[PDB]
Design a protein around this ligand. Sequence first.
Ligand code: GTS
Ligand code: GTS
Ligand code: CL
Ligand code: CL
Lengths: 206, 202
Amino acid sequence: VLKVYGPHFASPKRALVTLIEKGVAFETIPVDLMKGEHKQPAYLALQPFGTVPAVVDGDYKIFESRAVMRYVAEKYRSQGPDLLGKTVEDRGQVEQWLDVEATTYHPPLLNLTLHIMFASDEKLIKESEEKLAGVLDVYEAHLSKSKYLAGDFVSLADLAHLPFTDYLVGPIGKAYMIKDRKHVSAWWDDISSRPAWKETVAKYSF
Amino acid sequence: VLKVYGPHFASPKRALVTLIEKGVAFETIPVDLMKGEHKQPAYLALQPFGTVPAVVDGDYKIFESRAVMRYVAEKYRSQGPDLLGKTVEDRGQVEQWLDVEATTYHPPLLNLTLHIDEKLIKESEEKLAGVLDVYEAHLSKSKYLAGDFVSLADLAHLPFTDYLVGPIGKAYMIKDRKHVSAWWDDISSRPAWKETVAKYSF
Ligand SMILES: N[C@@H](CCC(=O)N[C@@H](CS(=O)(=O)O)C(=O)NCC(=O)O)C(=O)O
Ligand SMILES: N[C@@H](CCC(=O)N[C@@H](CS(=O)(=O)O)C(=O)NCC(=O)O)C(=O)O
Ligand SMILES: [Cl-]
Ligand SMILES: [Cl-]
């Protein structure tokens, strides 16, 4: 059975929500980051960068949360929603917005997340919020003409935004970044209410 | 008919080398970044984030350099080498290291590329060095990043690492790590990369 390491943290929930969306059986294994368990040789053999998640599926091992999403969505492509889309063109749009999350949306969000948890670099915080807001403005324009990021179907690209945006509008206290943008807000309301996400949060929150 | 915008810049070279490896016909279109053309309405209609590359393939439009690599590699899968691997598990490993490149390798390297801030530079180098130590242990056991076959994961490292070992003056980060060095020598001497560089250097 597929095993996911570090379910209580945010990046692993990208994989968990995908697993739950595809109806794939899995177990989770905690990793004690606060006591540095992830920097010890045992976990480093699973994830050489010492970060979570790592996934072991029998003899097969894979890390990087969005790679795991792609692996699960391709391996179990025929069951559940097709989170990769149907055509090569569809998958292209999915890969596109997934990389937008990885390279453009997530990094400034992570900086706000970390540096507001540090109360810190107040210049970095101001820059990170503005960069993120700039990204959300693009999303806003895009989502006003497209139901989901990759098209008229929900995909890995959308699911990838769930764990850290949830943090953003919750304990970080910046719900206005989502709320003040009408189309983004409706999109967020839609994907964050999907049963797979509700189950992920109910089961694996701090 | 497939068109690539901004060939003289580094990220677009991830797409170009993939296009050349796969034997795909394409045209290129310059984008004048220094005059701010990429921030004007015309290019923004192609890439709403105002960065290069953007790709237009007939009526189909796609951006993000690594997404373009994936799209090309899948659409033209049967021709040239299979840069996605053969199985679902192979592709998983390719996606894994492609994301390591996007999220772990490239961000500190990009800081070096841009700023060459004193502290940011020192920190980016240390961070990139730590990343390269992991590459070194891994490549001592695996011929390429994703396994015993060359893939998109390897190719994605070509454009900015070319900067690193050249104009940046930090070839030692690659050279001092035996397995990384041999791996780099290998992928950067592939004819598709030589052609990319020969044709599209700024
Ligand atoms: N690109 C990696 C990043 C994973 C990552 O950084 N995880 C964090 C935890 S969290 O951001 O997802 O909550 C971590 O392990 N931090 C440990 C450390 O850096 O020491 C992925 O997405 O899998
Ligand atoms: N995530 C994007 C990043 C694209 C990007 O930032 N391109 C740079 C050019 S380069 O880094 O590849 O040389 C750019 O357009 N910079 C212009 C700007 O942001 O104003 C991708 O990989 O396609
Ligand atoms: Cl955990
Ligand atoms: Cl150009």
